[PDB]
Design a protein around this ligand. Structure first.
Ligand code: SF4
Lengths: 1017, 1016
């Protein structure tokens, strides 16, 4: 019979590309290499000077866009810094540390809530903020080779998920009922212009309780420049609509077709009409012009950015207008004049209109470009040509058309000044000219409508930079109109700033005072109303999260701050009688090596050789009395430990109870009387000793007490049962896992103590032991139904916490997650749990896994075009294949231009719960139904792996894993590097487990014949 | 008595910047924000158009340079792809997957060996390769938001560590002795030009065994352009010297002051002198010139790149020449003509010479720039101005000096045919002009010296692109001179390619044939000679690494491939008697959630609910016979399992022994009993059962057998002892840890089987259980001294393997690391272990931790200036402080300039072992001496944390950890964001444990009185 230990021809063939170490250096000529290189090319080719067709292509071109896989990686990378410089560098002071922490914990709702609390246009800003000159410019990670965090992309991601949840914004909960609001809040308020500034101002005023807010917008569309000029390929119109609807949820009214102008709305007519306050947020409505372009028409080929961008927007943004607008026909060479964002967006937009070539002409040098590198990069990658040091002089017009523009040289002298060299000219051929010099306010009728407010030397409304108030106390202004900044986030901040002082002004007008300290409300939704309280062992917890007896509870002052932060409960560090006083050694707590040489945030574990508290029982008991007196609703559990002695346990437990502790937690780590039978060395490892100790405490106190169990036992259920039989009211599962974190190359340990560099076995904590704790909790919950369990072991998010609740635990203890961060994580845990419970009531989101939307086919986090001429073509994203994909996509865009259609918009409508929102008590133990013996698992219902070609990044890991750890069932194409799972798959699932792309590989029910490989008959 | 649970004023103050969730939105005016922004600025300011002083500043400006912290992070990120496109895109075909895998496993030696095996100028290339147009351009991770891997930087890092090791290259080991080499290998070989091409060619010929190789170099310095023109701030000269010395270790001779030219050395004089083969690697020695610059002199301010760059290099590269020379005095505005690497290096170099302003003028557009984007980036960040579409027409000279250059406008038309517009001119003011159009071969005397080889239409030596052979069979050529490529790596490849055919030619001349298949040797050093064999339980292992009984040993055909790859031993997947046949379910193996939502390479654990082998005992026994017959030196251990039955264990053990297995491994996972006698349900959890099973097997077979222990017990020592008492020859520690990996938000498990979505407890494997396995191994080793232990549990590198050996294990079993990669990791483990053992004999490297050099103060992996005017200044790397640091550094550079001195690179000298290189038997159990009870630990010898301000990146994590998990002992400055550990520190070590910068925080002996805090 055949050589069993040898691969047959077929398998040898399938293993052709499997890694094998070479015994010699490789020989490939330089010429051969030059040729082969093209086949695998991923990035832009430096030698290719021809741009990829972009006519009618408005697909997202942002390099910062992130999908869930990418967002989680970047969020975990963030150091989540104290007094973070990125936040200091953000105009709206977003708590970046907190929102990124939430994203890293998969709590997208909490992240979005944090974002929108300080920036009502959070999604728009995540997408368009020039971060390199703002938040990212101050990021501490810039000091590392890998670089600064993609803050904008993370903000965009969390906000997009929230948008997908279709949850509405709600009125401030702690606010009195609409009917009980003081009359001052009904004051008629008017805002002019529906752009970022007014949207923000109106939003914050509405949060404060004002019920009569109206925004008067000149145009038929809303959103300001975010709608009329920023390209669809950078800022999708549906984003703007989303943020507007959120504002409308607060009652803000918007009336379009109304202009602030002398023969229409004026400050005088508003005051006559009874308006108490007004906010001017009309931006800079007119284009900066140059005398040389006077008289030129669009038919001749001349446009100002104010003419051009809105035309492209109306045509590419579904919804914006009621009438379908044609895409401007831009053919030939295009000259764009300007060096700011306007110019770059005109250049890129011109390509979508069919431009053959685009020239960006600056009057200064490259170094003087105004737009941030990120913006410049977009025009650069699309092959726009940059021409520096040129100033326009004349537009040659022949046959009623622009045929060229004549320029003159410019240069900086010996002081810095700029001059024009007349004898040095340039005759640049062009068919279209677009001036993108900027914008201004110059309509006399508009300025007159603002009488009698004072205008500064820049001929713009003068305002106090702190209050945003004009010379007229009831009139405020912000955004581009003030002329201080030119970004969406700064305009949003102006409205935010103004809202507080408008509030102060109105209240004063009604004879009411306001807090000296500004107090703008946060952002709220129905999720915030979800009840996450839970009752266990007769105790009421405001929320299920608490601090475990550990380093974070080293001092009672820390517990105090934890309760102030919002933690539901806390354990004191374990303490004992005076005679059992201990002294710690140092070093004693080290990082885990459980996930490789990854330093900084998110350590996968810690190992400690710390003893019980070094502080006295007297200190802890007085501390408990103090804590319970000041925080009656927060549960305080005293952790205590004694040697195996009845009088001692009774004495200490009674002392703790007398201090006012809500309950006790018995630390069973103390060694016994003389080893002997293999029940370890600690009392907690022997059922008999545990039972006795619990009996002693039960007899001594009347308050509930829980036995903290060690996972270092053969059968933890035996110990849990012993504690129950002893009288314990529940058990804490579990303590740390015994281990050695590692040795240095010289053999010395870490931690290493004293001159002798000695160590002893320590306790492992963190996410690395979560599988062990989860097993412990579930096994105890199944063996002792209804017996209270306090879970501990790797809990670092609402999601992981919910896993333990589902496993049978009632409350959740945390240590390592706090050591990795700080007490503020409680805010993430609470909003996260509320969101998870809330989402369970939304029928239309059942396909989601918690807060994670179903994974859709993507590449780099961008939706893969579902084009018939692409699905099933085996065209990977590299080399000649990518060229083909681009050609196909370009053809589709042209077809879409032909086959016209565009008005099936989405009347945004919030999802409404269709079943009661589950309370904590309703989810406890729900996972137990799926757990059982191996025999209870079906060996008939087998699965096989299936790969989504469109999501694949061609690494071949699935292939390598099946080859050297599986069944050699995957074919890896030598040309496309695309994997195909064959019929020999056994569904072991290893490939799916090593794939870098989330959900690229999925396990599906086997449809073909199934037979175990016995290797022989 | 005070309120004990409240922070006193002092502590409230220290906690000032500690994170606290806000209950309201913040109010900060736009004006206030604009002002505050500058204080924290890290990156370049878009509105600042003035460049940082760079006169005489040759500090490394590469954005790709990596320090160990950064290199480990990037290496772990690499997907380590199959048939990798990056390698396909590398001109020298470097096995990137393997060298990066080695870096990820901290095996820098293995990584360097891999790099140099295919590229003898590996360090130079890591630093200068235009990767985006090469290897990186084909990287699969470009398909992710985070982007492609920094391959060049990783190559640079590994090569730099190897350089620091001061290990010499040695002659290929498996080559006959010098004396026994055929006469053909003594053939006189000549190479012209000591640049990358010839260095590579000479190196490979030397590896093949040729003993008379001489490189004739025209100049007094060696290295070619790497030395004469590439700037010191991109390629340090010591790198070039390092690679040249490695080549010289192979016997290659270099003679300077010798030129290929008529009247000097010619192909005819060489042939006449007895040379059998010649390689031409003289590059393109002359500058491409323009008629309009004829007659202009350096005194007037005109230079060609060939004049200028070497002048700067000779002045900034210590060791290049022997004469100390001043830097060229470049003052005023500088005009650099060109759009390739040459032009950009001239521009950046001009700034070091004192240039006030630099203009890069291109004949074409910005889109037509020849240099890759990172090269262009360097000039751009230093504020060089780019002027496109200009062609030089005249140079204006007044008072003996250039004052301006007049250009005419250029433009492309319908036929790409670039035209020049005469009526459109530019009068650009300038004091210095540097032409950087490129290079060529124009010396008639040099071309004559190459007679009679054929020259092509480009007037360059014509060569066959595959063999590198010229029209004369004994003459070959490569590098810039062939005119096909313009990169160091391609020039290196040309020499590599040529070496094989030169070898083929010479051998044929001596009447000898060569293999049809090219066989260039790998790179070797003394480390490769280190013996890593080990004997255990009477068995000899060629190396201590083996495959555990698991998924990687699902089929014997897989074990065969593992042995072919080099694995020392392997366990069969556990098998049993026919009556105990099992059937697996699916899904059954899932990724661990032990390190968060991190997917792809390096999963920290796996959970499986797989059963024993589904293949029959008949299959496994025949397979063992086949494997042992084909691989007699590779150890094969048969893993078997039976229910608690004497006859069964004896029958199966004898069946396995009869098949020829070297030993047996008893899988004790089979259930027995009810389940509350406090010893679980598996036989392996009960000492009595284990002792009886071992007794049965010992009585049945003569070969050694080991009991595989489960870590899921209260006292694993009791089980180990029971196995020993039963007759086992050792124990395998340990099997998987029982657990539940997690649940989805809806409560369903993963793995989930059937429509019922059911699951059962599985076994956790991988790095996440290493602490448990290491504890188990150490405990058994201390309780049962000398009892053989086969370790298993998270072993994924030579370094982790050595930890287990130090802990008492003799051999190392692996599963998860292979599931995370493939069988080739064995190559990394073996070279890594050899290196770790070798380094223990090097006295001058005692300060290193294994292969990791002692950590030096750095920022972004670059050395921090050990300047007096900088130390203790509390100047962080941001805002106005950074501005300050730049001013101080610039002043230091100017000071160093005035003191025209220094030059002692103290010739490179290999370190020599000063003690015997440890064998595996010499390190086993060495760490046990440090293990003991808690009471044996000194509570008198306490430590405190100390922070190196220069390495800090100001995140405040140390501060937050001490505040909410410590003793509130760190002050975090509100302006500089610099932390300071105060006297209240207790040395808990949490801050050091969460700091993102390796070795920024260190624990040092406490010098002040220690008093435990008692709460009062
Ligand atoms: S954790 Fe480390 S890099 Fe961060 S502020 Fe503390 S010493 Fe600096």
């Amino acid at each position: 019979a055949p050589v069993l230990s040898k691969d047959v021809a077929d398998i040898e063939s399938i293993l052709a590309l499997n890694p094998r170490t070479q015994s010699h250096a490789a020989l490939h000529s330089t010429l051969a290499k030059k040729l082969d290189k093209k086949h695998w090319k991923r990035n832009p080719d430096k030698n290719c000077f021809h741009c990829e067709k972009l006519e009618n292509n408005f697909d997202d071109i942002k390099h910062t866009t992130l999908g869930e896989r990418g967002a989680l990686r970047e969020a975990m990378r963030c150091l989540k810094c104290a007094d973070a410089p990125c936040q200091k560098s953000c105009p709206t002071h977003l708590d970046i540390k907190s929102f990124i922490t939430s994203i890293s914990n998969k709590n997208y709702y909490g992240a979005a809530k944090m974002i929108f609390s300080d920036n009502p246009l959070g999604l728009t800003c995540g997408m368009v903020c020039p971060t390199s000159d703002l938040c990212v410019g101050g990021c501490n990670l810039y000091a590392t080779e890998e670089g600064s965090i993609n803050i904008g992309g993370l903000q965009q991601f969390a906000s997009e998920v929230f948008k997908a949840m279709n949850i509405p914004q709600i009125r401030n909960p702690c606010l009195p009922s609409q009917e009980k609001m003081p009359e001052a809040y009904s004051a008629k308020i008017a805002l002019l212009g529906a752009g970022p500034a007014s949207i923000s101002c109106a939003s914050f005023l509405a949060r404060l309780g004002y019920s009569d807010i109206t925004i008067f917008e000149k145009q038929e569309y809303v959103g300001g420049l975010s709608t009329s000029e920023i390209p669809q390929f950078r800022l999708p119109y549906d984003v703007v609509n989303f943020e507007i609807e959120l504002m409308k949820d607060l009652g803000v009214k918007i009336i379009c077709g109304k202009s602030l102008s002398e023969n229409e709305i004026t400050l005088n007519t508003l005051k006559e009409e009874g308006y108490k306050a007004a906010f001017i947020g009309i931006g800079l409505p007119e284009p900066k012009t140059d005398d040389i372009f006077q008289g030129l028409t669009q038919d001749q080929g001349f446009y100002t950015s104010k003419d051009f961008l809105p035309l492209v927007a109306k045509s590419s943004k579904a919804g914006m207008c009621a009438c379908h607008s044609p895409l401007p026909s831009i053919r030939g060479a295009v000259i764009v004049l300007g060096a700011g964002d306007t110019a770059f967006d005109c250049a890129t937009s011109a390509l979508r209109c069919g431009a053959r070539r685009v020239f960006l002409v600056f009057r200064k040098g490259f170094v003087n470009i105004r737009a941030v590198p990120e913006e410049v990069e977009l025009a650069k990658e699309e092959k726009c040509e940059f021409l520096p040091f040129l100033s326009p002089r004349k537009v040659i017009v022949k046959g009623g058309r622009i045929v060229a523009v004549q320029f003159v040289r410019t240069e900086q002298d010996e002081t810095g000044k700029w001059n024009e060299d007349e004898d040095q000219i340039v005759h640049l051929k062009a068919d279209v000219v677009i001036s993108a010099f900027g914008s201004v306010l110059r309509d006399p009728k508009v300025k007159e409508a603002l009488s009698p407010i004072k205008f500064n030397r820049w001929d713009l409304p003068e305002v106090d930079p702190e209050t945003m108030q004009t010379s007229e106390p009831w009139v405020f202004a912000g955004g581009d109109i003030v002329g201080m900044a030119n970004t969406t986030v700064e305009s949003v901040n102006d409205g935010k700033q103004a809202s507080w002082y408008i509030h102060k002004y109105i209240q004063a007008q009604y004879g009411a005072s306001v807090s000296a300290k500004p107090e703008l409300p946060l952002f709220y939704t129905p999720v915030d109303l979800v009840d996450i309280s839970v009752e266990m062992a007769g105790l009421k917890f405001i929320n299920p999260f608490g601090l475990a007896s550990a380093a974070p509870t080293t001092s009672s002052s820390m517990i105090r701050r934890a309760f102030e932060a919002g933690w539901g409960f806390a354990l004191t560090k374990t303490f004992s009688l005076d005679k059992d006083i201990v002294t710690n050694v140092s070093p004693r707590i080290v990082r885990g090596t459980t996930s490789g040489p990854m330093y900084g945030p998110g350590q996968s574990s810690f190992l400690n050789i710390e003893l019980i508290s070094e502080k006295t029982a007297a200190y802890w008991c007085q501390s408990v009395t103090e804590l319970k007196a000041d925080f009656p609703d927060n549960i305080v559990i005293a952790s205590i430990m004694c040697s195996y002695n009845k009088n001692d346990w009774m004495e200490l437990s009674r002392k703790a109870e007398a201090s006012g502790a809500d309950a006790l937690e018995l630390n069973l780590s103390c060694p016994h009387g003389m080893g002997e039978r293999g029940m370890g060395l600690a009392c907690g490892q022997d059922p008999e000793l545990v039972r006795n100790i619990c009996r002693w405490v039960r007899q001594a106190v009347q308050i509930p007490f829980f036995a903290k169990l060690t996972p270092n036992v053969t059968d933890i259920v035996s110990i849990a049962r012993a504690a129950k039989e002893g009288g314990a009211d529940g058990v804490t599962a579990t303590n740390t896992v015994s281990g050695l974190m590692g040795l240095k190359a010289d053999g010395t340990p870490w931690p290493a103590v004293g001159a002798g560099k000695r160590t002893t076995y320590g306790g492992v904590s963190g996410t690395a032991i979560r599988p062990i704790a989860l097993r412990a909790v579930t096994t105890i919950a199944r063996a002792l139904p209804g017996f209270p369990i306090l879970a501990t072991g790797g809990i670092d998010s609402a999601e992981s916490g919910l896993q333990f609740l589902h496993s049978g635990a009632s409350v959740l203890q945390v240590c390592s997650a706090v050591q990795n961060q700080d007490f503020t994580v409680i805010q993430d845990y609470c909003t996260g749990l509320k969101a998870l419970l809330y989402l369970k009531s939304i029928e239309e989101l059942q396909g989601w896994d918690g807060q994670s939307p179903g994974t859709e086919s993507h590449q780099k986090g961008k939706p893969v075009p579902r084009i018939a001429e692409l699905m099933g073509k085996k065209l990977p994203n590299f080399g000649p294949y990518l060229e083909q994909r681009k050609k196909i996509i370009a053809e589709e865009k042209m077809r879409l231009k032909e086959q016209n259609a565009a008005f099936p918009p989405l009347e945004r409508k919030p999802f409404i719960p269709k079943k009661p929102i589950p309370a904590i008590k309703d989810v406890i133990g729900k996972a137990l139904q799926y757990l059982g013996t191996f025999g209870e698992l079906s060996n008939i219902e087998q699965v096989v792996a299936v790969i989504d070609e469109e999501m694949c990044i061609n690494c071949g890991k699935c292939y390598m894993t099946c080859n050297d750890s599986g069944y050699q069932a995957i074919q890896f194409d030598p040309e496309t590097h695309l994997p195909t799972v064959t019929d020999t798959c056994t569904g072991c699932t290893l490939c799916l487990s090593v794939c870098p792309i989330i959900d690229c590989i999925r396990m599906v029910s086997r449809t073909t014949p199934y037979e175990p490989k016995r290797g022989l008959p």
